[PDB]
Scaffold this active site. Structure first.
Site, PDB file in Angstrom:
ATOM      1  N   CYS A 159      28.875  -2.957  -8.675  1.00 37.84           N
ATOM      2  CA  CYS A 159      30.017  -3.514  -9.418  1.00 37.84           C
ATOM      3  C   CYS A 159      30.071  -5.050  -9.399  1.00 37.84           C
ATOM      4  CB  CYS A 159      31.353  -2.937  -8.903  1.00 37.84           C
ATOM      5  SG  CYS A 159      32.810  -3.588  -9.778  1.00 37.84           S
ATOM      6  N   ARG A 215      33.988  -7.144  -8.604  1.00 34.21           N
ATOM      7  CA  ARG A 215      34.648  -7.063  -7.293  1.00 34.21           C
ATOM      8  C   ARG A 215      35.540  -8.216  -6.837  1.00 34.21           C
ATOM      9  NH1 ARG A 215      30.036  -5.256  -3.434  1.00 34.21           N
ATOM     10  NH2 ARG A 215      28.590  -5.940  -5.109  1.00 34.21           N
ATOM     11  N   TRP A 274      38.568  -2.949 -16.493  1.00 36.86           N
ATOM     12  CA  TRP A 274      38.367  -3.347 -17.864  1.00 36.86           C
ATOM     13  C   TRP A 274      36.891  -3.582 -18.057  1.00 36.86           C
ATOM     14  CZ3 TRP A 274      41.826  -6.239 -14.656  1.00 36.86           C
ATOM     15  CH2 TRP A 274      41.298  -7.423 -14.103  1.00 36.86           C
ATOM     16  N   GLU A 318      28.496  -4.110 -21.597  1.00 36.34           N
ATOM     17  CA  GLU A 318      28.471  -2.664 -21.442  1.00 36.34           C
ATOM     18  C   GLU A 318      28.544  -2.006 -22.830  1.00 36.34           C
ATOM     19  OE1 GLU A 318      30.972  -1.032 -18.008  1.00 36.34           O
ATOM     20  OE2 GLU A 318      31.735  -3.079 -18.156  1.00 36.34           O
TER      21      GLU A 318
HETATM   22  C1  HEM Z   1      38.477  -5.174 -13.043  1.00 33.15           C
HETATM   23  C2  HEM Z   1      37.673  -4.815 -14.027  1.00 33.15           C
HETATM   24  C3  HEM Z   1      36.251  -4.466 -13.733  1.00 33.15           C
HETATM   25  C4  HEM Z   1      35.050  -5.061 -14.307  1.00 33.15           C
HETATM   26  C5  HEM Z   1      34.897  -6.172 -15.312  1.00 33.15           C
HETATM   27  C6  HEM Z   1      34.002  -4.280 -13.606  1.00 33.15           C
HETATM   28  C7  HEM Z   1      32.598  -4.500 -13.875  1.00 33.15           C
HETATM   29  C8  HEM Z   1      31.597  -3.439 -13.724  1.00 33.15           C
HETATM   30  C9  HEM Z   1      30.316  -3.386 -14.468  1.00 33.15           C
HETATM   31  C10 HEM Z   1      29.818  -4.307 -15.553  1.00 33.15           C
HETATM   32  C11 HEM Z   1      29.608  -2.200 -13.933  1.00 33.15           C
HETATM   33  C12 HEM Z   1      28.267  -1.629 -14.356  1.00 33.15           C
HETATM   34  C13 HEM Z   1      28.660  -0.541 -15.348  1.00 33.15           C
HETATM   35  C14 HEM Z   1      27.505   0.027 -16.146  1.00 33.15           C
HETATM   36  O1  HEM Z   1      26.428  -0.594 -16.195  1.00 33.15           O
HETATM   37  O2  HEM Z   1      27.675   1.124 -16.731  1.00 33.15           O
HETATM   38  C15 HEM Z   1      30.519  -1.623 -12.913  1.00 33.15           C
HETATM   39  C16 HEM Z   1      30.146  -0.465 -12.136  1.00 33.15           C
HETATM   40  C17 HEM Z   1      30.961   0.064 -11.059  1.00 33.15           C
HETATM   41  N1  HEM Z   1      32.192  -0.402 -10.789  1.00 33.15           N
HETATM   42 FE1  HEM Z   1      33.256  -2.076 -11.486  1.00 33.15          FE
HETATM   43  N2  HEM Z   1      34.392  -3.325 -12.741  1.00 33.15           N
HETATM   44  C18 HEM Z   1      35.753  -3.452 -12.786  1.00 33.15           C
HETATM   45  C19 HEM Z   1      36.697  -2.584 -12.060  1.00 33.15           C
HETATM   46  C20 HEM Z   1      36.312  -1.577 -11.084  1.00 33.15           C
HETATM   47  C21 HEM Z   1      37.299  -0.796 -10.281  1.00 33.15           C
HETATM   48  C22 HEM Z   1      38.801  -0.857 -10.333  1.00 33.15           C
HETATM   49  C23 HEM Z   1      36.436   0.056  -9.440  1.00 33.15           C
HETATM   50  C24 HEM Z   1      36.867   1.041  -8.431  1.00 33.15           C
HETATM   51  C25 HEM Z   1      38.150   1.188  -8.131  1.00 33.15           C
HETATM   52  C26 HEM Z   1      35.019  -0.247  -9.789  1.00 33.15           C
HETATM   53  C27 HEM Z   1      33.840   0.330  -9.135  1.00 33.15           C
HETATM   54  C28 HEM Z   1      32.547   0.416  -9.776  1.00 33.15           C
HETATM   55  C29 HEM Z   1      31.611   1.471  -9.361  1.00 33.15           C
HETATM   56  C30 HEM Z   1      31.777   2.522  -8.286  1.00 33.15           C
HETATM   57  C31 HEM Z   1      30.493   1.218 -10.261  1.00 33.15           C
HETATM   58  C32 HEM Z   1      29.206   1.987 -10.394  1.00 33.15           C
HETATM   59  C33 HEM Z   1      29.495   3.143 -11.333  1.00 33.15           C
HETATM   60  C34 HEM Z   1      28.269   4.007 -11.442  1.00 33.15           C
HETATM   61  O3  HEM Z   1      27.350   3.845 -10.617  1.00 33.15           O
HETATM   62  O4  HEM Z   1      28.226   4.838 -12.373  1.00 33.15           O
HETATM   63  N3  HEM Z   1      34.936  -1.195 -10.864  1.00 33.15           N
HETATM   64  N4  HEM Z   1      31.775  -2.323 -12.800  1.00 33.15           N
HETATM   65  C1  LIG Z   2      35.814   0.806 -13.367  1.00 32.97           C
HETATM   66  C2  LIG Z   2      34.806   0.517 -14.444  1.00 32.97           C
HETATM   67  C3  LIG Z   2      34.750  -0.766 -14.978  1.00 32.97           C
HETATM   68  C4  LIG Z   2      33.813  -1.034 -15.978  1.00 32.97           C
HETATM   69  N1  LIG Z   2      33.757  -2.267 -16.530  1.00 32.97           N
HETATM   70  N2  LIG Z   2      32.975  -0.064 -16.412  1.00 32.97           N
HETATM   71  C5  LIG Z   2      33.007   1.200 -15.906  1.00 32.97           C
HETATM   72  C6  LIG Z   2      32.059   2.245 -16.469  1.00 32.97           C
HETATM   73  C7  LIG Z   2      30.820   2.489 -15.616  1.00 32.97           C
HETATM   74  C8  LIG Z   2      29.936   3.546 -16.281  1.00 32.97           C
HETATM   75  C9  LIG Z   2      28.721   3.905 -15.422  1.00 32.97           C
HETATM   76  C10 LIG Z   2      28.019   5.207 -15.827  1.00 32.97           C
HETATM   77  O1  LIG Z   2      26.667   5.182 -15.319  1.00 32.97           O
HETATM   78  C11 LIG Z   2      25.774   6.225 -15.726  1.00 32.97           C
HETATM   79  C12 LIG Z   2      25.251   5.899 -17.131  1.00 32.97           C
HETATM   80  N3  LIG Z   2      24.290   4.851 -16.809  1.00 32.97           N
HETATM   81  C13 LIG Z   2      23.792   4.921 -15.437  1.00 32.97           C
HETATM   82  C14 LIG Z   2      24.510   6.152 -14.867  1.00 32.97           C
HETATM   83  C15 LIG Z   2      24.689   6.071 -13.332  1.00 32.97           C
HETATM   84  C16 LIG Z   2      25.537   7.241 -12.876  1.00 32.97           C
HETATM   85  C17 LIG Z   2      24.995   8.492 -12.589  1.00 32.97           C
HETATM   86  C18 LIG Z   2      25.853   9.529 -12.184  1.00 32.97           C
HETATM   87  C19 LIG Z   2      25.304  10.898 -11.854  1.00 32.97           C
HETATM   88  C20 LIG Z   2      27.234   9.299 -12.105  1.00 32.97           C
HETATM   89  C21 LIG Z   2      27.743   8.034 -12.407  1.00 32.97           C
HETATM   90  N4  LIG Z   2      29.083   7.752 -12.340  1.00 32.97           N
HETATM   91  N5  LIG Z   2      26.883   7.058 -12.801  1.00 32.97           N
HETATM   92  C22 LIG Z   2      33.937   1.519 -14.912  1.00 32.97           C
END
Ligand code: HEM
Ligand SMILES: Cc1cc(N)nc(CCCCCO[C@H]2CNC[C@H]2Cc2cc(C)cc(N)n2)c1
Ligand code: HEM
Ligand SMILES: Cc1cc(N)nc(CCCCCO[C@H]2CNC[C@H]2Cc2cc(C)cc(N)n2)c1
Ligand SMILES: C[C@H](O)[C@H](O)[C@H]1CNC2=NC(N)=NC(=O)C2=N1
Ligand SMILES: C[C@H](O)[C@H](O)[C@H]1CNC2=NC(N)=NC(=O)C2=N1
Ligand SMILES: [Zn+2]
Lengths: 403, 405
Positions: A107, A110, A279, A284
């Site tokens: 993320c 953060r 947001w 993305e």
């Molecule tokens: C405040 C606004 C936020 C922005 C701009 C932001 C930014 C991002 C971005 C750009 C990614 C990569 C997403 C992708 O490539 O699909 C990401 C992933 C992630 N974010 Fe943040 N984020 C935000 C809020 C949060 C919040 C509130 C949480 C948890 C409470 C969080 C936890 C994560 C997690 C766990 C991932 C990895 C998701 C995955 O592996 O699928 N984010 N975020």
């Molecule tokens: C909180 C938040 C903020 C923000 N700006 N964007 C998001 C959306 C995050 C979407 C991430 C989804 O990831 C999927 C699709 N591409 C890599 C893949 C990784 C993955 C795999 C699996 C099994 C679950 C998961 N959640 N994520 C969430």
């Protein structure tokens, strides 16, 4: 040995000591690095995780060693020894949820970690009640475009029974209808969930941006289908500040990014349904969702519209179309007054976050491949920053699909 | 199923397993506790013999003679030579194989589809700094080939027990000077400030331009390095223009044609070649994105954006992205017009995908550093972004080595 971490643009160096706090192995070994892989490869154990977390919590409130601290450890110990499990107080849950986000290496957002609305939904006993909590979440988080980060935490996993689960990967997903000729209409990322919805009784549409219903599952029950009320799902029509035909493309995206398939682990307890939202960062949508060849794949359409030389890679038509699509996303969200952050601003904030965390905790776990944006990598400061990736708890984790 | 890393391509949905990584005899910087894959500099007696035997086995396998009488005789030869002298020496065909394998093995190189086409100049007879210079000039002439670039490596004598190393002090054969200014800024390439000052200390009379080609500082065993000016006609350069933005030419930017790394150590069967410069041709992003746009390099992004009349006061105009694209286009257009080999980042990464498939079939994998392979602009627009990669050290290898001073 504590890793030396260097910024190559500025010449500055830090040492990561936080990683010594990791109790969970990643995929790499001395023989080979698997850092680019998307997916990862008794009571005494629960008890040590629980104690470690309770210690984290009381330290955060500056109350280490206090009567309240000692008594809380006894409560946790008593409950585990008798029942094999325990329960968190609401304040601990709130601290745990923020820490899980803080600890998330993928993320880039953060800097915001301390600002998270936590909805306690552990008194939930049915898919119907889950829907109600999810609607309240969406309403709160969306806030007419002034987006606020939020998490709703449904009841923890229990040894006896099935999990609470939201089957959808996000709360807002566009349908992907597979044709008999293999191709996809809508979002190819969502083919499987779309078909699960139809199969569970949903009447499908036939558009490129049909919002999916939610499949919500209470323990050991078939999932139930819930259509989100259209007024709850804020969407942004995409247009371009100068290219008139761009709006004719009929493109759109939703305001609220809310991940709903990840497991939240706090003190050894596991929350199989705990959807969270913030947001969007513009790349993305503009880069990945719209330009991935296995997503909406619009690069060629835009390029042709821009009258670019598609005959050859070296005209950089792809790069040029992508930039304009990213600009349209930024323009369109700004015009609609919906919160969004561009990749330059977001990565600048992350650099500040890295510095904050160095002072506060002596490091910050970060996954370089995910942190660096999918366009203009080296134009952002994070490209030039070395990063150490490791697992801390509380954590957000991946988990199996419930079907 | 298989007890080897599973590797997925997320664009295509396809799966492979890397079995080649089992052949790694050298640890990288990662552990189960923490990944250090993003670090730029990741943190002999019978030892020589076992490295030597492994390399000899690799050589005889590549010519399909493993277990043969010739294979067993070479092994005995090597252990006999090590037995009496403490070291050994490579046959000519062994050096050629070893040098191509080192390139084939290089996880950071996206151009490896070309690995089988490498001209290997054997300079193991070199005995002076002057002769190094002759060899290097010949390398440059051959490699440049008036713009039709050809991959080459020149290999100088190996490191020897208690005797000084052959070293080229410059990090590349072509480098632009970086002159520290009174105000603290840099004219020219800030990457080269140290080597510039070393050239001056060793008697070079400095210029004062932004694109002054540096002399080579060349070191033969146990001697002071010696300074050699490259004849200007040997160093092909490309003035930069843009296909539609007519003012871009007025900026006076340029880059040299030949990318030739000169500070790495070539290791083959435990033998160490401390001077072994190698060259290919550029991928356009190296010049147009990193060299010209890095904040700590020429840093031209704002200048170009101002010329394009972009809004540089706000990140959300994407002024940086727009300017970088045009600078990258100028690089490609200018090299094309000048008939100098260059490859764009789309074409390069496509070919690296083909290379990955070739190597899956040939060796059961391909060591690759994802952070280095993915281009610095338009990352996810290229197929390599979507490809999982396994990074590990194989030998023969190119390695970093300490600076001579
Ligand atoms: C405040 C606004 C936020 C922005 C701009 C932001 C930014 C991002 C971005 C750009 C990614 C990569 C997403 C992708 O490539 O699909 C990401 C992933 C992630 N974010 Fe943040 N984020 C935000 C809020 C949060 C919040 C509130 C949480 C948890 C409470 C969080 C936890 C994560 C997690 C766990 C991932 C990895 C998701 C995955 O592996 O699928 N984010 N975020
Ligand atoms: C909180 C938040 C903020 C923000 N700006 N964007 C998001 C959306 C995050 C979407 C991430 C989804 O990831 C999927 C699709 N591409 C890599 C893949 C990784 C993955 C795999 C699996 C099994 C679950 C998961 N959640 N994520 C969430
Ligand atoms: C044939 C044309 C070639 C192209 C287009 C090519 C492409 C590249 C690119 C884009 C990089 C990244 C450089 C950077 O970010 O600064 C690289 C690094 C590398 N290449 Fe290749 N390459 C080619 C030929 C070669 C040859 C002939 C060799 C050796 C015989 C080689 C070995 C390496 C090594 C060792 C690195 C890492 C350099 C370092 O870590 O400093 N390349 N190459
Ligand atoms: C053969 C070839 C082909 C091609 N297209 N491009 C090149 C040029 C590669 C230059 C690599 C320079 O890398 C330096 C500058 N950025 C990171 C740093 C890595 C590094 C460190 C050290 C100590 C030595 C070294 N060779 N490389 C070489
Ligand atoms: C194979 C490679 O690890 C994947 O393509 C990664 C690369 N980096 C990434 N970064 C981010 N932020 N999201 C991704 O989905 C992503 N995909
Ligand atoms: C910190 C980070 O590892 C460095 O900025 C890396 C990232 N990726 C890179 N990739 C390539 N090809 N060359 C680099 O110099 C480079 N720098
Ligand atoms: Zn690693």
């Amino acid at each position: 040995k504590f890793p030396r971490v260097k910024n190559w643009e500025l010449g500055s160096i830090t040492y990561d000591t936080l990683c010594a706090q990791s109790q969970q192995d990643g995929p790499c070994t001395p023989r080979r690095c698997l850092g680019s892989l998307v997916l990862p490869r008794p009571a005494e154990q629960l008890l040590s995780q629980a104690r470690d977390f309770i210690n984290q919590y009381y330290s955060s409130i500056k109350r280490s060693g206090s009567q309240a601290h000692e008594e809380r450890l006894q409560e946790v110990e008593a409950e585990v020894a008798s029942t094999g499990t325990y329960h968190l107080r609401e304040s601990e849950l709130v601290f745990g949820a923020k820490q899980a986000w803080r600890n998330a290496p993928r993320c880039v957002g953060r800097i915001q970690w301390g600002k998270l609305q936590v909805f306690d939904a552990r008194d939930c006993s049915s898919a119907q009640e889950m829907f109600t909590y999810i609607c309240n979440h969406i309403k709160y988080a969306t806030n007419r475009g002034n987006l606020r980060s939020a998490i709703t935490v449904f009841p923890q996993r229990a040894p006896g029974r099935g999990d609470f689960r939201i089957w959808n990967s996000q709360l807002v997903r566009y349908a992907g209808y597979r044709q008999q000729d293999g191709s996809v209409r809508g979002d190819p990322a969502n083919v499987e969930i779309t078909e699960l919805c139809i199969q569970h009784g949903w009447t499908p549409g036939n558009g490129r941006f049909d919002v999916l219903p939610l499949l919500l599952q209470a323990p050991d029950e078939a999932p139930e289908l819930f259509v989100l009320p259209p007024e709850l799902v804020l969407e942004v029509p995409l247009e371009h500040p100068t290219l008139e035909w761009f709006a004719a493309l009929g493109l759109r995206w939703y305001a609220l990014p809310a991940v709903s398939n990840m497991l939240l682990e706090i003190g050894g307890l596991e929350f199989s349904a705990a959807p969270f939202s913030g947001w969007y960062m513009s790349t993305e949508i503009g880069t990945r969702n719209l330009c991935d060849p296995h997503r909406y794949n619009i690069l060629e359409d835009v390029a042709v519209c821009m009258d670019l030389d598609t005959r050859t890679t070296s005209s950089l038509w792809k790069d040029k179309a992508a930039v304009e699509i990213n600009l349209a996303v930024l323009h369109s969200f700004q015009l609609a007054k919906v919160t969004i952050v561009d990749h330059h601003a977001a990565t600048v904030s992350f650099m500040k976050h890295l510095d904050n965390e160095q002072k506060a905790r002596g490091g910050c776990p970060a996954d370089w491949a995910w942190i660096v944006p999918p366009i203009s990598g080296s134009l952002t400061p994070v490209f030039h920053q070395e990063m150490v990736n490791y697992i801390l708890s509380p954590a957000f984790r991946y988990q199996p699909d419930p079907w």
